[PDB]
Swiss-Prot record, chains A, B, C, D, E, F, G:
It comes from Thermoplasma acidophilum (strain ATCC 25905 / DSM 1728 / JCM 9062 / NBRC 15155 / AMRC-C165). Component of the proteasome core, a large protease complex with broad specificity involved in protein degradation. The T.acidophilum proteasome is able to cleave oligopeptides after Tyr, Leu, Phe, and to a lesser extent after Glu and Arg. Thus, displays chymotrypsin-like activity and low level of caspase-like and trypsin-like activities. Keywords: Cytoplasm, Proteasome. This is Proteasome subunit alpha. The 20S proteasome core is composed of 14 alpha and 14 beta subunits that assemble into four stacked heptameric rings, resulting in a barrel-shaped structure. The two inner rings, each composed of seven catalytic beta subunits, are sandwiched by two outer rings, each composed of seven alpha subunits. The catalytic chamber with the active sites is on the inside of the barrel. Has a gated structure, the ends of the cylinder being occluded by the N-termini of the alpha-subunits. Is capped at one or both ends by the proteasome regulatory ATPase, PAN. The keyword Cytoplasm applies. GO terms for biological process: proteasomal protein catabolic process; ubiquitin-dependent protein catabolic process. SMART domains: Proteasome_A_N. Gene3D superfamilies: Glutamine Phosphoribosylpyrophosphate, subunit 1, domain 1 (3.60.20.10). The lineage of its organism: Archaea, Methanobacteriati, Thermoplasmatota, Thermoplasmata, Thermoplasmatales.
Curated annotation (Swiss-Prot), chains H, I:
It is found in: Cytoplasm. Component of the proteasome core, a large protease complex with broad specificity involved in protein degradation. The T.acidophilum proteasome is able to cleave oligopeptides after Tyr, Leu, Phe, and to a lesser extent after Glu and Arg. Thus, displays chymotrypsin-like activity and low level of caspase-like and trypsin-like activities. It comes from Thermoplasma acidophilum (strain ATCC 25905 / DSM 1728 / JCM 9062 / NBRC 15155 / AMRC-C165). It comes from the Archaea. GO terms for biological process: proteasomal protein catabolic process. The keyword Hydrolase applies. This is Proteasome subunit beta. The configuration of the closed gate contains an opening large enough to allow rapid entry of tetrapeptides but able to impede the entry of proteins and longer peptides. The active site is at residue 1. It is an enzyme of class 3 (hydrolase). The 20S proteasome core is composed of 14 alpha and 14 beta subunits that assemble into four stacked heptameric rings, resulting in a barrel-shaped structure. The two inner rings, each composed of seven catalytic beta subunits, are sandwiched by two outer rings, each composed of seven alpha subunits. The catalytic chamber with the active sites is on the inside of the barrel. Has a gated structure, the ends of the cylinder being occluded by the N-termini of the alpha-subunits. Is capped at one or both ends by the proteasome regulatory ATPase, PAN.
Amino acid sequence: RAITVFSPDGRLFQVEYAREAVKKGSTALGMKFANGVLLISDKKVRSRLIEQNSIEKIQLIDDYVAAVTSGLVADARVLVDFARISAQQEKVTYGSLVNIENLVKRVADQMQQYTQYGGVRPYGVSLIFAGIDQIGPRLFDCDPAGTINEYKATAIGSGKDAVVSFLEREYKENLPEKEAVTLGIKALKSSLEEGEELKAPEIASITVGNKYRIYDQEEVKKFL
Amino acid sequence: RAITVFSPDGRLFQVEYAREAVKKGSTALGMKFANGVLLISDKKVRSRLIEQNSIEKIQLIDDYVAAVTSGLVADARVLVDFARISAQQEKVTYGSLVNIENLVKRVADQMQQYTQYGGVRPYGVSLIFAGIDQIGPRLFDCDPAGTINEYKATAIGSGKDAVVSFLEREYKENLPEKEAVTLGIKALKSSLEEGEELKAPEIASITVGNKYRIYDQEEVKKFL
Amino acid sequence: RAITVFSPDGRLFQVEYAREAVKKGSTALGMKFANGVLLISDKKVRSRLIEQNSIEKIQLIDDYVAAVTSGLVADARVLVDFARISAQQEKVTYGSLVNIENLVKRVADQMQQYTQYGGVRPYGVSLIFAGIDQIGPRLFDCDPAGTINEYKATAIGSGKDAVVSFLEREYKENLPEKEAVTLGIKALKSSLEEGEELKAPEIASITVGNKYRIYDQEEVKKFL
Amino acid sequence: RAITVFSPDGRLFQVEYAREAVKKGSTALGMKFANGVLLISDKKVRSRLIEQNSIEKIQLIDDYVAAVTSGLVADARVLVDFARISAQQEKVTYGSLVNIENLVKRVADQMQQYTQYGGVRPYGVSLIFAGIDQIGPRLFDCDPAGTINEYKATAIGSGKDAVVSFLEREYKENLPEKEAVTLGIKALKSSLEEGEELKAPEIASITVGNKYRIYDQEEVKKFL
Amino acid sequence: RAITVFSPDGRLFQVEYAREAVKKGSTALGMKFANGVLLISDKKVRSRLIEQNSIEKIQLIDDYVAAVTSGLVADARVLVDFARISAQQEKVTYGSLVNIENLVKRVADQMQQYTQYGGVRPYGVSLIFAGIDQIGPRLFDCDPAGTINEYKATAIGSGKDAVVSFLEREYKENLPEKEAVTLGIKALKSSLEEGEELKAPEIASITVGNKYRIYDQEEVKKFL
Amino acid sequence: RAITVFSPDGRLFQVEYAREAVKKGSTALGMKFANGVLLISDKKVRSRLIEQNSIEKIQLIDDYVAAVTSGLVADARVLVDFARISAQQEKVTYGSLVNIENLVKRVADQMQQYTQYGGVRPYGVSLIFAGIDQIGPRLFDCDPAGTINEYKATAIGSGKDAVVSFLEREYKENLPEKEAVTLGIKALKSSLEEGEELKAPEIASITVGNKYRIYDQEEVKKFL
Amino acid sequence: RAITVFSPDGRLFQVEYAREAVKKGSTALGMKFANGVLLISDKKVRSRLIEQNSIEKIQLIDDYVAAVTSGLVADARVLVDFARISAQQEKVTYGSLVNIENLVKRVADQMQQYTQYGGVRPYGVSLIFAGIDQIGPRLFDCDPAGTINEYKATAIGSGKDAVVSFLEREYKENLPEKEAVTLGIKALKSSLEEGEELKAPEIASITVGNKYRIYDQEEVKKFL
Amino acid sequence: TTTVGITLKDAVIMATERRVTMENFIMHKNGKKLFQIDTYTGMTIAGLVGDAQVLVRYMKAELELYRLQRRVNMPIEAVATLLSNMLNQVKYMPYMVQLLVGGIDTAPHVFSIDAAGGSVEDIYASTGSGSPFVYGVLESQYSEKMTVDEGVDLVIRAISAAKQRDSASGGMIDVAVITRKDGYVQLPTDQIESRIRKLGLIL
Amino acid sequence: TTTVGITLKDAVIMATERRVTMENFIMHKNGKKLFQIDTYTGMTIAGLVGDAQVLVRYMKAELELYRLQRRVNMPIEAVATLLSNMLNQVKYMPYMVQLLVGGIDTAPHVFSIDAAGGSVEDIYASTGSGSPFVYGVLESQYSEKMTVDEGVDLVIRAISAAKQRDSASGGMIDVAVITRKDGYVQLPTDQIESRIRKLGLIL
């Protein structure tokens, strides 16, 4: 019953409340490895009546860059499409999306705007972009505040604190893909796995030199 | 006496209150079957003075895609027409509505907008789109939050939880039309049928290869 | 001291308060009969100083479609004129107002807009459109919420519940005009007639094949 | 400390409060007579320092139609000029102000708009238009709500209830001008004349076939 | 902590509060006389450091019309300039400012607008226009409400009630200039002169047939 | 927690609160003398780390007109630049800034606007313009209310009341520059000099016939 | 629960609350030296998982001007880019960014705008610009209020008061680069070094005659 | 049509004839081409009547407004620059006119203004259809050491000459002299026609 | 109309004649085409007066404002650039003009600017109707080893020549020499005409 303004202690309560919404989001993470980067999200399903795969959490922005999101689903979708067309835009003017960092910055600024322009609720979502650009494999995360940072490995959603600590500890610099996906899935497990069953995780990866690869049901089940 | 903003726990109360309105809506469901998909709504009538059929709950968007809605009637109507013209739009530019998923996404985004743009009340309605597209028979549902998901079978309105559980249990994958409509009507019955009489349900279906078919009074009465 | 938003139970209180205003409106009804439809409103007059007929409650939209309204008089007038020009519009583009249902839908949507667009009070009025179109004699009613339905017979205003029940009971399907107007006037009487005197009702009718006919003082007094 | 919205009982309190302002306005009335209509307002003056006649309460819209107003003076003036140009507009397009009823309807709608368009205070004024049109001598009144009605005779301002009742009783249908102005002035007297002195009333009239005539000081004093 | 809306008793409190500001303004008056009109304001000065005459209270709109104001100084200035250009406008289109009454009406309407258009504070000022037009010497006054009246003599500002009563009593119809300025200065004295010293009044006058004349220091001191 | 509107006693509290901000501003003054005018501000410095002169309080608008300000620094800067370009504007259209009074009036009106246009905080600053124009040496001051006055000598900021009284007493009409700057610096001293040390004052002056002269460190130290 | 308006004591509480946010920002400082200026920020890192250098706090605006910021990270970024393009703008019109002071003024004004334009939260950030322009090496700082000042040396962020005092005391005018960076790092240490470890500071410098130089990991570690 | 502004000692004199024509069809015998525009300034119109007249009104007002707000009369070069700005600002859809604005502030002035906002001051200049002819006689007999009376005659002569060699010009020639002493004063028709007769001129 | 800007050692000289004409009708004998635009810089106008004038005022005020805001004077190349941008920006409805801007910041400079915002620096350059003629004598006698005094003469000669072969040029030729020491100084009319006489030139 007040706003998006500064509290007496220098905080945007609205943006905080927003952050809450993301914590209650599913858990996902990613990390750079050998010569690429991978993304992995916990695909926690309910009814037999849901159309399985259709609930894709790892979404492509373009053949060389993907992102995974956490928070208000609706907000995540619309913010994804924005990045998609925004991506296309850089391609059509310059002829090539040279720096991915830039792609995230644009979408970040979009979110930052609702942080101060009065009459409008902020984007209740956080997400991470992963892919390989002119500079190489890159990993970024972004929160409802528009804050953006590049990582070596990270997570987001519900079990962030948990999974992040595991990595913080057992993360291995230049871990080759097979072992990297493993460490990851292990890390994802521990975290959200207060409820034992890891269920069916959604995992995809890309390596310098080529396009993204989405792991098939059986392949992922192999590490599961 | 406050808004569409985030609560201290990360929730859009307005969108919640909206959801309430839909629960108080009539009950309807649908499911994919053999080589098509069917829709069925409970047409609960009151006065002898109402013009029967005129109160059509299952509405066509185009000869190959229909949708049924639940919530504030007015809101449902206007949101239907939007999808209709929106459908036409894709047809006139591309020459063909190739992916139905896309149609629902547009209408969903429409609803998502009122989720954050300050001065305007959200759409108090949920609905499901069913039809066969380039990909095949498809089933989607959408809530006032703009959240959208694809199903194998589902329901909405008043007796959602109930009917959904029945299916959740007795839903048969590739059930041929005749048996599918049956399972459905049975499922619809159990649910809302705390009040015994199923009355006159409204049912329609389409099968890959051709246009939609609306069941006639007698035909439906046959399964009733 | 709050709005047009959803209450914790899923209701638009403003639209409700609006409905109240219409209940306090005069009573009127209509019904389909033989091969046409008729409209009848209770013309309750006060002073000798009022210009009698000038207080016409049944208004024409065009020679083949009329409507009668109940609620905030001002709101009713402006909403009437909108339908009038809106009617003209369909005539000038398509060359003919083929489906009357459509006319009401447009005016309904107009009302539905004020149901959600923030800063603006809803239309405190309900009305019914009656006439014969390409499809035949048609009867519709509309409330401040933008909800619209087609009837075989119905009423609106103050004594709705009452008169409606009478019809609900003694309504005769294909009653020939003379008997239909009678049943109607009888129904109107019972209802508002807690105060005995029916006064001078305002009645008009149209039959397939021709234009609307407004009953003259003596003719109506004949059934009175 | 709330609005222009509907109260729990279906009322626009703001429009009510507005009505209050008009009651506290001066008293005036008019009535149709023989073959014309007349207007009469109580010109209650204070200081010797006021420029007498300059405080004209009966204002001309055009040589064949005049109006008198009651309520917030400022609001009345601006609303008068609107009708004036609005009058001119019909003249310049159609070549002739055929129906005066229409003139009042436009100005009424103007007022009705502020009845619902959020951020703006309604017009705190009521007025009556009198004149002879294509149809003949016509008399209308209008309130802050935008409600408009045609009379045989009526009043407005402070002593409405009073003067109106006198007429309600002693109004004579086709009273010839001389007697009509008398009945009027008598009626005006009784009403506001709790304070004995009628002072100097302002009276004007028009009769079918010609333009309006404003009574001169002596002529009015003759009936006084 | 509420607005510009109607109180339960039919009053615009904001406009009232505004009036307060004007009472606390300096005192000035004017009156028609022989064959012209004069204006006189009490020029109450403080410091030796003020630039004397520069604090001109009687301002010219054009060589034949002047005005004096009372209330929030800033508001008065801006409202003056508006009248000035507004004056010029009538001159450039019609070729001549024929009726001064009209000039004041425009500026009045300007003020009336802020009386109802929501988000904006009214003009906290009252002023009087004096001059000779096509009709002859004319005298008008205007308040923050946009109310305007023509006088034979009047005052405004702090000692209005006082000075006005003196005139109300001893005002002499066709008093020749010399005697008129006297009666005036006497009237101005009595009023504000609770504090004995009249100080140096500011006086100017115009007479039919020619332009305005501002009295020089010595000339005014002659009547002082 | 309310506005820019009129209090029950006729005051714009917001504009008052604004005035407060200016009192807490540094102290400065100016006065007309022999054949020019001078400006002097107390340059109270803190750290050794500040870039001395860069904190110029007396700013030029153009070679013949300068101004010094007091209040919210930011607000002062932006309001200065406005006057600067505004100055340029008069130069480019008319070919010469003939009357400086006009320059201040424009900037004053700018400030007056925020005094009533709803959603926007007033300019928390007061300033004085000094220079020689077509009319001669001129001195003006302006407050957050948009009120403007011409002086023979005056001050503003913190020690206004004090310094002003000294002048009010010991101000010498046609004091030649050397003595004028002295009287000034003496006056400035007494006032703010509750804290003994006058520090390093900032002083500049201009004399009819030529451009402005900013006193150099040593020259000012000479009077110090 | 109120605004950006003036408090009864003349203060913009919102801008204050904003200042709070900046105090909680990292610590950084800069100072002019020999024939250039240097910038140094405390790069306090957490996880092994962060991409080291990517978290650059000292950002370039152009090869000859850099700036470092403190406060809400998002706000800082967007405000940086604004200065960047704003810089480019001056280059493209005039052909050369002659005065850096001007660059900061523009960005300052940007911030000042949100200080009064109603519906929008101020920029919760402070920053300092450093570089060499046509005038020479220049050092400026700016706060959320839009206040800007030029220094000989200064700091900002968390340990401002501390580090600033050290300099205030031990700052050496024309200290040659090597010694200047030392004094600086020493000053930075003392301040934030309540927690002993200085970690890895980020330092860069430029000297008249050439472009900016960012110190490499080892070089900085040399002074560390 | 022909107008002329001439500067001398402590005065400025402006005069024009007044025939308004439509090609060869001289439709109006008594137009007005000389206008007072401020206490100490006048202007002469030449070109299309529509554009000139509206232009005169704007100027007239713009000046009065300026006087009131600034408490002092607008300087001549200022009025000329103002005008210059207006005209050039719309050069691509110009007021097809040619203006001469004379007056006296600190000293006498006279500026020539074209449809593109080109403004230039001279000691005298002529404007209009018959310009050449007058420029002929002025070039021949004007002297800065003339008396205001000599001036008024020279001018009449100048116009009467152009009236002879230019069918577009004609009718009663009228003059106004503006001095700081008396201000802008237009000479009495009779007195003018008197000087004509005396000079042995015609019309 | 002819104007010329010339560079030499530690100064820049700029001069123009001053006849303003309408085809063959020489209407104004004393127009002004040399304008100081900033303490250490001047500009020469050439082309359509209306455009030229407004352009000059814009440039003047713009320069003054910048000086105040930046506390330093705008560099010559910088002011050239600004002008360049303005002009080109409106190439399709241009200010039909040709500008020459000279001044001295860290060194002397002179830029030729065309209506399409083309801007180029030379060691000297002429602008106007008589450009070729002056370009002749300059191409024949200018030497970067000349003194400011030799310069002023050269310039006077060149323009004088153009005056002989170009009916569109004429009137009193006037010069202004700008140096860091004294700033922008316009030579006195008598001294100019004195040099003319001494040189055996005319007009």
